[PDB]
Amino acid sequence: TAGPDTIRILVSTDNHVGYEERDPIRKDDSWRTFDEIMQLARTKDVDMVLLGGDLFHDNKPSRKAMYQVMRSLRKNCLGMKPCELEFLSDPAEVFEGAFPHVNYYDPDINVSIPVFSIHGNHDDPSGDGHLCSLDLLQVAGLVNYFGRVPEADNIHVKPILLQKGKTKLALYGMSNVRDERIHRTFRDNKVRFYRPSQQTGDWFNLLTLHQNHYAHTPTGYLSENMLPDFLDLVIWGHEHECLIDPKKNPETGFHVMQPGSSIATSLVPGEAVPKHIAILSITGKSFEVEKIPLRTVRPFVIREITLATDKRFKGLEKKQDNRQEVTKRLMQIVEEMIAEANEMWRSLHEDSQDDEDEEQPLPLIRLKVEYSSPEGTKFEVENPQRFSNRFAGKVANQNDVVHFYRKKT
Amino acid sequence: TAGPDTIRILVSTDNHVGYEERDPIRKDDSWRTFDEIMQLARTKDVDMVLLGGDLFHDNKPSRKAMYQVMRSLRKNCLGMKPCELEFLSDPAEVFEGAFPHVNYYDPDINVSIPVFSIHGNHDHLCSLDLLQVAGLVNYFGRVPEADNIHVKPILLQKGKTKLALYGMSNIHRTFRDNKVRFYRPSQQTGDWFNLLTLHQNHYAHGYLSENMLPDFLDLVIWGHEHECLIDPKKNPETGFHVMQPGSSIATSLVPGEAVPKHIAILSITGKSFEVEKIPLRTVRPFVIREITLATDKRFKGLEKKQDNRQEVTKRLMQIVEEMIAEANEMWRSLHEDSQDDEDEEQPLPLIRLKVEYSSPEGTKFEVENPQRFSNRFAGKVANQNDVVHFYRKK
Amino acid sequence: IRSDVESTTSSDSGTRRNYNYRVSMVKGDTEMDMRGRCSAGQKVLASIIIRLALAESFCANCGLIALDEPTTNLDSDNIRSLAESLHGIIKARQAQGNLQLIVITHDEEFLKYMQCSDFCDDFYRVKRDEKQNSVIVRES
Amino acid sequence: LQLIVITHDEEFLKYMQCSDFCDDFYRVKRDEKQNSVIVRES
Amino acid sequence: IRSDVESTTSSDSGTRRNYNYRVSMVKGDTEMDMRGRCSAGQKVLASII
Amino acid sequence: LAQLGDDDIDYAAIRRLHIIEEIEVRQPEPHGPNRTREQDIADGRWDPRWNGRKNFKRFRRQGETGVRMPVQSVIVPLEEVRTK
Amino acid sequence: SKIEKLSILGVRSFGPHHPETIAFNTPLTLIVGYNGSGKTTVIECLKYATTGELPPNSTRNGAFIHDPDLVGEKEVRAQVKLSFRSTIGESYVVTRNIQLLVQRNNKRTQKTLEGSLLLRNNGERTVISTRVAELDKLVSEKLGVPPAILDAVIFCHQDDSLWPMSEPAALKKRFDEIFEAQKYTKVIENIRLL
Amino acid sequence: PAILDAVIFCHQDDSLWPMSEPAALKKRFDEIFEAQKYTKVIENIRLL
């Protein structure tokens, strides 16, 4: 729903630009996805874009990694469209003194779609001047940097006050910290937040953070319940899994939105759910989410099979000297995944203005295998490298397809 | 001269930003000087600034090196000032496909003073490109291949005045073969002023000879050379004047860096031009001299017939110390104005003394450890690691 | 390359002849050792010369030497200083007409210095194919 | 375990300092007399 | 750390005991000389441990 | 269905142990919708010496959609010179 | 005193089904490759071509042969060739062959195969010998260099490129080989049997 | 003391003596083990 009293916000995270920058077949999946998000921003007439974090995958991105990010922002964030937002927060408190004004308040740059962000773990402050890669963009005037945490001990969090018509918005920022360090600060109650007081209410509150959600270590994860109760919706920025659908936590009283990355960095079950970016429309105290799937993402399928309990060739591979037949079963396993992978890609691009122009990519496959067997028995395992090599030209991740392992007890 | 037809160009070069910013004392040496250049650009009301090249010292500039160059450009290059320069060359020919149009034609980023530079380094993308995408600095002078040399001048106009700006970035064999081909406008021919800036390739093995270039040019700019010779000179064989802008910070302590540094304002009217030099203030003071021990009158060789270690140090103290005397005074002379309103602190000057300890015969001058000698001036010289270099003629 | 002839502890019924070998530097009178007291660049140039010089002494007929990643682990200033250094050696040996020098480097920066000189006709390369088997190509 | 590490890398040292398992790091500095001195900082 | 206990040479009437040492890296069954790689991080780490 | 972890800490206590500090709200200012010449001069953006100077800049500020200034460039082609 | 051309087959990463070749040009021959791209393998083969000695502690386990699992055949044949010009105007070519078998067991046995030295006379080919022990002696003489030097100087391993700048006693050890000092020390020890 | 000299308080660039080359690596273990001194008692009693 678009109206004078409604503010539309785009949500994205863990874009990890630059990942696998030098793989021969997968070099341009890192950024081309990113170049498509902004193209969505201009097309969908969104007010402002909020990046979860981890904008750059490497602490010192190469020129190519940086160059394509700046190009995409310039094309799709500059125009003659006037901004419909009012900046009520003090420029000096959150931003650098070099350019205290927000970017679209600048007189010399015609900013159309302001983009907000928070630095991530792979983009933490470093170097001589405590500069993070984002800082180069902000001076260029293309990205607004906020949620920065100068002192790790005394965490001070000031929201950014935004208002469009009668819709009043507060944007709380809390950038990446060592996982268990943030565990400890919240525990000590040293952290604090600064509420608006002009109404002493009627302010929508949105929080974006880039810490892990659940981890084995009790301290690693920043527990959800530790957040205050006055918040309304939270942007969990680290878990690459996608659960764009918001869910109201019972004890707190706010919804939780977990976007998920734009590229699949680690071939695991989590990064298999289809990728999405959300359109967050806010009006008054109400919000609505319209999930938008990404078209350019590399397809991907993962299957978990345990040989011992596998119905297929359950006992047929129990005979001595089972190496030629062992691979024979798997070749039929992968080829099904290849077909299934190529099926999804066609479904998404079934109809489009450039469907004919676009060419099918090579789907990614990963087959994780457990081959523990009783002592009197055993299964032969082929070379992992050769096993995948036979798919050259059928899968982008040629070097590895399967990962054999035995559970340790 | 400042009129509706005159065109003012601010020429610089070899700003080597980021040069030795690891050292504590000289970290602010590099980028601060660059800032002063642009500060002059806006204050002096120039129309375009022409960087001789080597805008960055390291092919992979550190973030803090880039961050401060972009900060400097944004404050000074972007402003409400109108631009009186009319672009006549096709954008496609001499620009990259991403943003072929010159930056100040952009409908989204106003540019008060366009910046024209030469290519910095190749690792397609170069260091400068990160600036061009932001639109801060225009580009030119790119050459596709050594064998295929094609120079496309950028034609610019202001009122009646007409300017042509050839670009030849970055081998000696090709020029002798005459493979290079220059495009020169034959329409309205003879009324185009011509300016050629060339930055000799760092990694060539061999330098361009002034006699190789054509005879129709008017003014030329050599970039790589660091010694400053700002006033132009005419070569009788070539028939055109040559100018050597010189660097902005002393990269290598040698006699060349000694001469004071300037950036010129290249005013052009019609087919003729006038030049005036602006001394660069922030540059670190630098003084150097060479003394031969044997010939030194001051020593009179009282070391030759005796032991030396104890008093040799005593001898150089009077020589090193007095160098610092004129090191600050010349800084003081240039900083008399403004009554030290800004940067009131006195920077530690750079000193280099070139001593030859050649002994005539049966003489053994004692030489102290360089490092131990240098650090004795901690707090009086920035380059505490080395203040004197000792060598014996071979 | 200095040495000590008398490095053998006297033995009643054993020759036990081991000659100490220790290379040292000279600046004026001082002859301090180079294990320390010198920068990284100084060593890498040092080793190459010793291998070079040592080879001809024993044979004097074969000018074959094989440096391996000599430029690795060097700061910016030294690598170019190293590059010009190699340039002098080859020109010096060029007149002699006997030097077959093989050098391997995976730094993009270092390699261009030698080929820019254009004395070497071409340079080889090694790549990993779809099957991760090394391949060799010739590039000018 | 009483490991001792010497480094002048801001990165490498800040990582362990932020780890919170290092109480403090000592320093070595050249005073006006060019003489080494140790000053404790946390 | 693969110390070679068979490096000891057999003298005519004596043991002449001497053990030859060379540290190796193991990836599955394969074992490599560990020398010649460019993973300076691996080198320093292995030395430390 | 949801995953529950018992950390045995009173979240109700945590909520009241949190301290909230009021932050002042600044009054809005125009985002340079259409700044007049006197506004820039008063702000020191505009130099009176620039008055009367020809401008080839194709730049347009936001909110100036109605007013358009056209820029026409007569591109002069280049000629390969007979190199001696 | 010159080396003409090299050809590898089935060594370490290099594939066993297609020979790879590289030719050396006077004075300098360059080799650049991405990290972990088998840049150093070229040198190793050059060493094994001349001095006929496998890399250190690498002859067990077939560490110097393209691992049989990668190709997928229990049997792997590795070949190394070297073309060179003798101290005299004549030029020969050298060959060597290795074979590795995978039994039922994970264990694998390295087997040395016959090699040869060929005479590439003008419009003629002749076989000089086929016994490697001799070929080791032949090759060294043709090159005009003795085997000691190549062990520690001419073909230096990657990590120890700075052996002259190593620990002084470690610096000492190598010269003992370079001087070929040990042959004559045990001649003295033969005078101790006296 | 052998461990004190070789392992514990290692010299700066010698920090990688676990990755010094095989023969130097061997010269270093033989020191740490305190083995060379009992090779000397064997060879003395062999002369006996």
Ligand SMILES: Nc1ncnc2c1ncn2[C@@H]1O[C@H](COP(=O)(O)OP(=O)(O)OP(O)(O)=S)[C@@H](O)[C@H]1O
């Ligand atoms: N038996 C083997 N079978 C298959 N591959 C092997 C075998 N032995 C070694 N390799 C690989 O072959 C490659 C050889 O690379 P090397 O030449 O030793 O090192 P490099 O290529 O020079 O990389 P650098 O020098 O450290 S940047 C490496 O990737 C090894 O892992």
Ligand SMILES: [Mg+2]
């Ligand atoms: Mg190698």
Ligand SMILES: [Mn+2]
């Ligand atoms: Mn991430």
Ligand SMILES: [Mn+2]
């Ligand atoms: Mn993350």
Ligand SMILES: [Mn+2]
């Ligand atoms: Mn320069």
Ligand SMILES: [Mn+2]
């Ligand atoms: Mn230069």
